[PDB]
Amino acid sequence: TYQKPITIPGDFPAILKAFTREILRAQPSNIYEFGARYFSGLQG
Amino acid sequence: PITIPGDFPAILKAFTREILRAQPSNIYEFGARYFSGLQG
Amino acid sequence: NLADILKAYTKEVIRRQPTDLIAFSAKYFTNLANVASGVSNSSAPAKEQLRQVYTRGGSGGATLTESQVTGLCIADAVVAKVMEVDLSKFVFLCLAMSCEDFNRVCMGVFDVFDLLTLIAHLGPDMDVTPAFLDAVAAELPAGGGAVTYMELCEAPSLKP
Amino acid sequence: EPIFCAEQIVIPHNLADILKAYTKEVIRRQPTDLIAFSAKYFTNLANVA
Amino acid sequence: RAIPKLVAVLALPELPDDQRAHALRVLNGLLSTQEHKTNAVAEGAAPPLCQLASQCRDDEVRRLSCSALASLGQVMAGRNGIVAAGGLPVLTEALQTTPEQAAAALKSFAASNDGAAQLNLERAAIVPALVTLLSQPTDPAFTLTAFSNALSTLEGMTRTDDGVLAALDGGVPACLVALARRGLEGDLKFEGRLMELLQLVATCLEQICHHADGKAACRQAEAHKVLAELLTLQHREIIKHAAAALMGLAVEKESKVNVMLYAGVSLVRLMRGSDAELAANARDTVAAAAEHLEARRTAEMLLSMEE
Amino acid sequence: FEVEPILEVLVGKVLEQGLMEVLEEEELAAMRAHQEHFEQIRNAELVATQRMEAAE
Amino acid sequence: FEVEPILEVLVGKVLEQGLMEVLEEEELAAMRAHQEHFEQIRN
Amino acid sequence: KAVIKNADMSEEMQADAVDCATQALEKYNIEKDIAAYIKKEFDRKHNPTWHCIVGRNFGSYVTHETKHFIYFYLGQVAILLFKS
Amino acid sequence: KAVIKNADMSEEMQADAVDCATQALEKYNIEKDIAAYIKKEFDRKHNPTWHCIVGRNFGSYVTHETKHFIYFYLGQVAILLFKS
């Protein structure tokens, strides 16, 4: 019937609060370098 | 564009102060007659 | 009391945000005070210019009649009269005081509505004389009952 | 111009746009810890940039 | 960042009756403020407010407490925490009192959810209990605000979980028939916001007759009286939602046939006039209910379909 | 010497509350406009869906 | 501690926006897919 | 609790100043009124010429009667209390 | 330029304070430095004590000697200056 949009952030709260914490601390001059190196460091 | 400009601060302050001084008996005639007096 | 009513005033003004704040506040407070509203919406009042109700003393049950008027919302007046059914006199007086008679008031009152007490009440809404209604009756076509507008407009075709 | 309270922070609506676009891309496929996929997302965003 | 002091004073053991209301009002204003919303949705401020509201044991205390819990619960993280800590106990207890604050406390959850009332739906008995509350009349014209809020709540929750509400005896068209049978006419509470209540009832009717369980509800109810009664105030949401409900009724052969055949002059007048906003859903209703009461097509052809 | 503090707190809290509440209420009403629009579009698509289901 | 509220407000806003947007887009895509299936039928 | 950074004051009087400043920062709402309550209470219980400054970004160059000066943090504000 | 937000001085003193502050700001930037310069100039010019506060966000509640109190902005930076 009505498909259930179960796409709810459960660990996305944690990850995005972390990421927006980083950016709000940083005030990036360029969005790309800060975001990409953030996710590279998360990889590391 | 939502910021109530500098007027309403002073207008509210004076309205409150004068209604306190006059101590009205009927609560809502005051603002109408008061703004009539303030117009001129 | 004072604090909550002033809260309501403030919320409404911080809802509007005009330019000429003194003048707008004056106009707003005056309109909230008086029943007479400068906007003066018609055909769907939304602003009780109830001088007719003041003349009535309540127009029947005051609370019930005002409840019907408030729950109302040409077509809106028709719906209000339908929901209601005195009260008809008040409704016609409203539809007149919101209009200007040119025999269009009479035709519209008949449409929204068996056409005697209507004119009887509408005479008092001028705050004419019953002799005018008597002359209209002497000129009345289809005198069996509720006439039609076109049928009745035979002798007194040139009328206000 | 040092900061006084929480209000002095300056991060524009561009960050909100970043986050909305990110959320759309990270809920379209439901990746759920997409870290490598997000890295490639940044890779081709740069390649376009 | 001093909302915590008011929070502690609120959650003190045996929250007294000295003021007990202005503290809650200030706390609600804070937890509403976009900053202090976070400062109360992340800084704890336990549901002891809900616990005391439940253990009211008074008259003028429970109403204010329930209003406070209501206003507190209409936030994303606030409602998430309420669910995680059993706030559904409050969202169930609140629907027990006739007062407007307590009654609308139940509705505020889904009214803010707009699709995230899964907690209320999983509390499947809570929806039937609140229906038993906001269907029986007691001190209306203030419970009417709660009624409209609950109608919006249903418009959301039923649209999300059609079978979940239709299976319950609250009924996708059964509650619509109950609303019509009440009429909510009273004296001064006809359609103040009850026009919007009817609008949300009709929107849930469309979104529930979408599902064949809602079709069973339409069969069990036959609530064209609801449309013929509340379609006169001319509310835009009411008109659009009611025409969409008629369109989605086509799943229910019974109620759709009844409505499309033994309708009022409202459909003919809507076709005649220029009510374009409702006209889309009205034409959808005509096209889908040409099947149920199949004589509807011939009746339309007779009634100047070549116009 | 009564005007100062009582009117200070009154006016200040009232003005701040209005400035917050207009913001929040307008945002939520915009949200509800969004939902009405896309739900009406999907309701038209859903009467099409009813035609789908009854096609067989 | 001086940033937490702003953190939260953008988090919630983007959560709701992304949710409803992708939701409705996928629903309309599915219904258009059913439409093209009916076009296949009418072939 | 509280933090006392830079002082020229007896320890018991520092404790009383912290208690006073904490009750003020709790009950009142605006920084100038915090200052007002602190000054009025030290006036009503010790001596007339007090001066209070509750700020969040400010640098001063003040003169104080000896054995009366405190510069301390409580939460999110810096309180300066001196006698003159 | 100079916004004399709240003062109770005289006109000669007014100009003296404003141009001394303007002079100080083009010399230094630290709050300590500006307050020190301004208040040393005013002590050596007028009277024994002068409490100077330099900052951007702060309250106050201070007892002043009549005709020796001023509170003005120079662009964005604010100066309180009072003798007691």
Curated annotation (Swiss-Prot), chains H, I:
Which InterPro entries does this UniProt record tie to the protein?
A: DLC_sf, Dynein_light_1/2_CS, Dynein_light_chain_typ-1/2
Instruction: Tell where it localizes.
Output: Cytoplasm, Cytoskeleton, Flagellum axoneme
Where is the major localization of this protein? cytoplasm
Q: Which Pfam families match?
A: Dynein_light
Q: Which GO terms describe its cellular component?
A: axoneme; ciliary plasm; dynein complex; microtubule; motile cilium
Q: Which domain of life is it from?
A: Eukaryota
**Which keywords has UniProt assigned to this entry?**
Cell projection, Cilium, Cytoplasm, Cytoskeleton, Dynein, Flagellum, Microtubule, Motor protein
Regions annotated as coiled coil: none
CDD domains from the entry?
DLC-like_DYNLL1_DYNLL2 (cd21452)
GO biological process: what's one of them? microtubule-based process
Q: Which SMART domains match?
A: Dynein_light
Listed under subunit, the entry gives: Consists of at least 3 heavy chains (alpha, beta and gamma), 2 intermediate chains and 8 light chains.
Q: Could you tell me which PANTHER family the record lists for this protein?
A: DYNEIN LIGHT CHAIN
**Family the entry assigns:** Belongs to the dynein light chain family.
Name recorded for this polypeptide: Dynein 8 kDa light chain, flagellar outer arm
What organism is listed for this UniProt entry?
A: Chlamydomonas reinhardtii (Chlamydomonas smithii)
